[PDB]
């Protein structure tokens, strides 16, 4: 498969910055695609196409020259509208199905006493959907349990740490309970006190 | 806008002077690839994706050309108003539970980047440049950028940042 990018519409010390983006919004697969291209000059978005509008629109006044221009020429406007299919739908149904949407890394769950408080470190998983719950002797613990936000490692993996305030009495068994789409059955790591 | 997934395709960014540019693809906040503009080569974040899909970097090159053009025209149109520098902020954390004698990866996270030109360099107060990987600039909803710098080392370290809108370099020790 091949990735296609949108076509940046062309126009007609002190530094200056220009940025373009092609945003595709998929809900329920391709059942509802929204496509928005953005033209940003010096961190201020000034022109924008939006599928919901169906034509270019100026966002600041400097956008009127280009919007009105890009709306006037059908070879451009029809192309940008059709990019909702030639870029968004094409990329989702094609290369993303083979890469991003097929990726499944299952997490690494280890428990360790921090000093008291246990830490269930859950690392190196994809995608982002994950459930982590503490049990003490087999009964779900929801008081004294604090989790970080979802931490994005950048290399297409996530990590989350879940700390439980507890007290080690010899005999107790604490278990970390992890649910993830990559796991056929949940992971259960035990820490016997 | 709400969605199950977001594909942010064809992120072209150009700045003058200096003639620095960047072309990237993104899915759900993660970098699929950037096109190296000097070697004219699609560089995938995960080589496996580079074995499962492909992208022609020449499209990145023509899009960069277009954005350079637009940067000229709009640079003139607004009577040459310059980019406004900004204050970037860093945050350091490890990829794995840190284990002495067992290596892993350390992560420095700079944000509120604008314009996209920083020296993300490191502090054993003394420069270390080896076994470091930087990512490319990621796009924020506010059109500033963030960038990660990974440092691999002996689980024995400050992340020094040199931006324009930072009066003096800001070191974020671990």
């Amino acid at each position: 498969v091949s990735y296609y990018g949108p076509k940046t519409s062309p126009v007609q010390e002190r530094h200056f910055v220009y940025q373009f983006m092609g945003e595709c919004y998929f809900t329920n697969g391709t059942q509802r695609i929204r496509y928005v291209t953005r033209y940003i000059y010096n961190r201020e978005e000034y022109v924008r196409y939006d599928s919901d509008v169906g034509e270019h629109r100026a966002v600041t006044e400097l956008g009127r020259p280009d919007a009105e221009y890009w709306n006037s020429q059908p070879e451009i406007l029809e192309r940008t509208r059709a990019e909702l299919d030639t870029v968004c739908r094409h990329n989702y149904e094609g290369p993303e199905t083979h890469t991003s949407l097929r990726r499944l890394e299952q997490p690494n769950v280890v428990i360790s006493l921090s000093r008291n408080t246990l830490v269930c470190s859950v690392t190196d998983f994809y995608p982002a959907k994950i459930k982590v719950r503490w049990f003490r002797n087999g009964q779900e613990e929801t008081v004294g349990v604090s989790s970080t936000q979802l931490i994005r490692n950048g290399d297409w993996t996530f990590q989350v740490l879940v700390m439980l305030e507890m007290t080690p009495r010899r005999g107790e068994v604490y278990t970390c309970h992890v649910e993830h789409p990559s796991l056929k059955s949940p992971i259960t790591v035990e820490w016997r006190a | 806008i709400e969605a199950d997934h977001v594909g942010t395709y064809g992120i072209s960014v150009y700045q003058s002077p200096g003639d620095i540019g960047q072309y990237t693809f993104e899915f759900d906040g993660d970098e699929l690839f950037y096109v190296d503009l000097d070697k004219k080569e699609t560089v995938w974040m995960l080589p496996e994706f580079g074995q499962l899909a492909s992208f022609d970097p020449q499209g990145g090159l023509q899009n960069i050309a277009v954005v350079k053009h637009n940067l000229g025209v709009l640079t003139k149109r607004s009577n040459s108003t310059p980019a406004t520098n900004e204050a970037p902020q860093a945050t350091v954390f490890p990829k794995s539970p840190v284990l002495l004698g067992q290596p892993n990866t350390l992560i420095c996270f700079v944000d509120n980047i604008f314009p996209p030109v920083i020296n993300i360099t490191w502090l054993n107060s003394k420069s270390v440049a080896d076994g470091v990987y930087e990512t490319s600039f990621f796009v924020n909803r506010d059109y500033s950028f963030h960038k990660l710098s990974y440092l691999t080392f002996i689980p024995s370290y400050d992340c020094k940042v040199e931006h324009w809108g930072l009066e003096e370099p800001v070191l974020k020790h671990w």
Partner: T-cell receptor, first 111, second 112 residues
Framework: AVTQSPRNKVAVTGGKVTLSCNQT?????MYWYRQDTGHGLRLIHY???????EKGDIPDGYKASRPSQENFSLILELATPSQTSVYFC???????????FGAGTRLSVLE | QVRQSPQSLTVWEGETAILNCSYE??????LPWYQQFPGEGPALLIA?????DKKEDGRFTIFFNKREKKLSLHITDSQPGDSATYFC?????????????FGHGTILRVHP
């Protein structure tokens, strides 16, 4: 208009030839082609803008130079009989449906 | 690779010349025909998009067939002024690259 220069040229092997192309369409893309019986038109080098040159399908033997938006030049440092051909320069807009060719240059490289 | 047939075609005035073209890449979505007069450089004659099964331009017509990836140019009421080399080209416009892939051309000689 897209005009080339020179339009005819005879050279000896091992000499340096410089075909040179000028365009006044305010186009951004510029291409260098050669035409030969049994091979059609073949891309040698092209360019998306000033300062950049991209390799075509048959770039060996030639270097390209785009010093400005209206000038695209093709250079043979060690001219060779196999480089005897008819060369055509083209221009095009960004995402353009049309290439605009020049009139051509006939070049012979002789032992 | 684009493949054109026949390599030479000779026609009498008023006949209908048919230049045939076939390509391999399924991703080609834009196919233009360039006309080259002797001593000149080629110029865009007529082009069709993959989404259309045709293109009418006066006496020149493009019949496109996407399933077979086959292409054909019909020149009706051929005039001796149509004697020229015709090239079939194809590009995947989605790749944003701007390289047409040219065929080898058919030399059309129209007898007066």
């Amino acid at each position: 208009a897209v005009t080339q220069s020179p339009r005819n040229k005879v050279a000896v092997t091992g000499g340096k030839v410089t075909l040179s192309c000028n365009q006044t369409n305010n186009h951004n893309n510029m291409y260098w082609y050669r035409q030969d019986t049994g091979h059609g038109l073949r891309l040698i080098h092209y360019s998306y803008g000033a300062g950049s040159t991209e390799k075509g399908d048959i770039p060996d033997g030639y270097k390209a130079s785009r010093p400005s938006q209206e000038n695209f030049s093709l250079i043979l440092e060690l001219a060779t009989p196999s480089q005897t051909s008819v060369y055509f320069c083209a221009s095009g807009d960004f995402w353009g449906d049309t290439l605009y060719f020049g009139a051509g240059t006939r070049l012979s490289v002789l032992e | 690779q684009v493949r054109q047939s026949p390599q030479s075609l000779t026609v009498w005035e008023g006949e209908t010349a048919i230049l045939n073209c076939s390509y391999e890449n399924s991703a080609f979505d834009y196919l233009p025909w360039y006309q080259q007069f002797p001593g000149e450089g080629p110029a865009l004659l007529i082009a069709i998009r993959s989404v259309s099964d045709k293109k009418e331009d006066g006496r020149f017509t493009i019949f496109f067939n996407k399933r077979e990836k086959k292409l054909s140019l019909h020149i009706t009421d051929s005039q001796p002024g149509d004697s020229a080399t015709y090239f079939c080209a194809g590009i995947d416009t989605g790749a944003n690259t701007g390289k047409l892939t040219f065929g080898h051309g058919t030399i059309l000689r129209v007898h007066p």
